[PDB]
């Protein structure tokens, strides 16, 4: 069953999304989002985008670390809930996992499912291309074309980031 490797990684992806979207406590939500980011970078690395996966992994690890510092600082409780300390959190986690595995079982039986779009049941390895790409990877040249072509995108993004820095300075002032 090694041909469904991306499908298994996506199953772990939705599992982690169910794990942190039930909102037990932001520490374990951060752990679930770290796991989800890892399997997501694995998925996009399996599709060939190694640079994009490594970049999103690094960015979300840094963001989740700053988040963890914030929740240790500010959003804390005397008795944090791991997953089973609250009935509603454990309940919604259980139904999320149950719905995910029900969808897995249904798509693994007749190889077809209808949830609002229509989806197949075969592994994604069919939709790959059969030819080679020469002496370059397409994603690397595509992101490297940001400076040679996307001047407007670079300008508006740099202005947005500078304005964001100014906004962060202005909001947390107090007077």
């Amino acid at each position: 069953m090694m041909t469904y490797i991306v499908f298994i990684l996506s199953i772990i992806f939705v599992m982690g999304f169910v794990g942190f979207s039930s909102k037990p406590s932001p520490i374990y939500g951060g752990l679930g989002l770290i796991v989800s980011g890892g399997v997501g970078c694995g998925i996009v690395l399996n599709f060939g985008g190694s640079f994009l996966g490594l970049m999103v992994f690094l960015i979300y690890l840094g963001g989740m670390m700053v988040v963890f510092g914030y929740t240790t600082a500010m959003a804390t409780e005397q008795y944090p809930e791991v997953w089973v300390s609250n009935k509603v959190v454990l309940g919604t986690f259980i139904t999320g996992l149950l719905m995910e595995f029900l969808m897995v079982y249904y798509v693994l039986k007749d190889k077809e499912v209808e949830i609002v779009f229509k989806f197949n049941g075969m592994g994604d390895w069919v939709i790959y291309d059969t030819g080679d790409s020469g002496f370059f990877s397409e994603e690397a040249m595509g992101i490297a074309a940001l400076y040679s072509y996307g001047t407007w995108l670079v300008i508006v993004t740099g202005w947005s980031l500078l304005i964001g820095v100014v906004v962060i300075m202005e909001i947390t002032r107090g007077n």
């Binding site: 640079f51 490594l54 690094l58 670390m65 700053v66 963890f68 791991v82």
Partner: protein
């Protein structure tokens, strides 16, 4: 067969970590006008064996107020990340020849902080929380400057592949045209691993032990070998980045001996720095990288992105 390769990769680095404990104790003693361990065996060769057997027959002491699952997961994650991040290093042929090994090591160095953070948060103690937040402050102090240093020094290599870094330094060393980046990288590697004078997490002066104050023997050894394998990997990474040795495809043992002695000298320099400097305050380290290192890093990045265009010396990407 790949099992043989991975076990012959991971066992000698554990032996190297143990003998690094020995060399650290003995060299640090000799720099302090005294002797190191020499009574256990002939010139103290059996001290790491005694320490390792002693630490694995002691009580584990899992606390009652600590979340046990994260308390167990954190040292496992620390040792694991210390293990599967030695792989992309070319010695002179890497075990895993990643096309983007530099970003891989950056991401897994960012991931190893979470072991310290969850060790501090899991063990319900105030000193562990202080150590974890000091680790957070150290990470936000060093990470961006480290990444910009790597980007500016990789503009002459051509790509992020660690295997092609030997070919780049085939003519001359990379420390000659990038020595300010080399000094800033050395300070960044010192501050990355929480080594002195930027310890700040296992602080035995401000705190008792920091994040591993509630970790008794068995799990405590895991953090020790993770830290020492981390300093060896930083030394090897710096040697590959800035001190590229002569490589003969018919005799890889020449390159192995060369980068082995260079990494040994770098570790000796690490312990040389450790014994001679007072500990930084963790707010002064925050203003060190963000005010002194960062503007010079930005200026050197612009210089190194405008230099090869200026000189018709843009390196190939193949």
């Amino acid at each position: 067969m790949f099992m043989i390769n991975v076990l012959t990769l991971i066992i000698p680095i554990l032996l190297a970590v143990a003998f690094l404990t020995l060399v650290e104790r003995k060299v640090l003693g000799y720099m302090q006008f005294r002797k190191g361990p020499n009574v256990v065996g002939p010139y103290g060769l059996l001290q790491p064996i005694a320490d390792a057997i002693k630490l694995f027959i002691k009580e584990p002491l899992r606390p009652a107020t600590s979340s046990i699952s994260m308390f167990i997961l954190a040292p496992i994650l620390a040792l694991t990340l210390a293990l599967t991040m030695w792989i992309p290093l070319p010695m002179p042929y890497p075990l895993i020849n990643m096309n983007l090994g530099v970003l891989f090591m950056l991401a897994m160095s960012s991931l190893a902080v979470y072991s310290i953070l969850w060790s501090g948060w899991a063990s319900n103690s105030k000193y562990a929380l202080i150590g974890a937040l000091r680790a957070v402050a150290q990470t936000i102090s060093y990470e961006v400057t480290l990444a910009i240093i790597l980007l500016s020094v990789l503009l002459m290599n051509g790509s992020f592949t660690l295997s092609t870094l030997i070919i780049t330094q085939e003519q001359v060393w990379l420390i000659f045209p990038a020595w300010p980046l080399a000094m800033m990288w050395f300070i960044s590697t010192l501050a990355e691993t929480n080594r002195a004078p930027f310890d700040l997490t296992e602080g035995e002066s401000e705190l008792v032990s920091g994040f591993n104050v509630e970790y008794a023997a068995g799990p405590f050894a895991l953090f020790f070998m993770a830290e020492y394998a981390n300093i060896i990997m930083m030394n090897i990474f710096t040697t590959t980045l800035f001190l590229g040795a002569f490589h003969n495809p018919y005799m890889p043992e020449l390159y192995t001996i060369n980068f082995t002695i260079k990494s040994l000298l770098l570790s000796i320099t690490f312990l040389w720095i450790r014994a001679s400097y007072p500990r930084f305050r963790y707010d002064q380290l925050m203003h060190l990288l963000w005010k002194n290192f960062l503007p010079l890093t930005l200026a050197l990045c612009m210089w190194h992105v405008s230099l090869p265009i200026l000189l018709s010396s843009i390196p190939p990407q193949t």
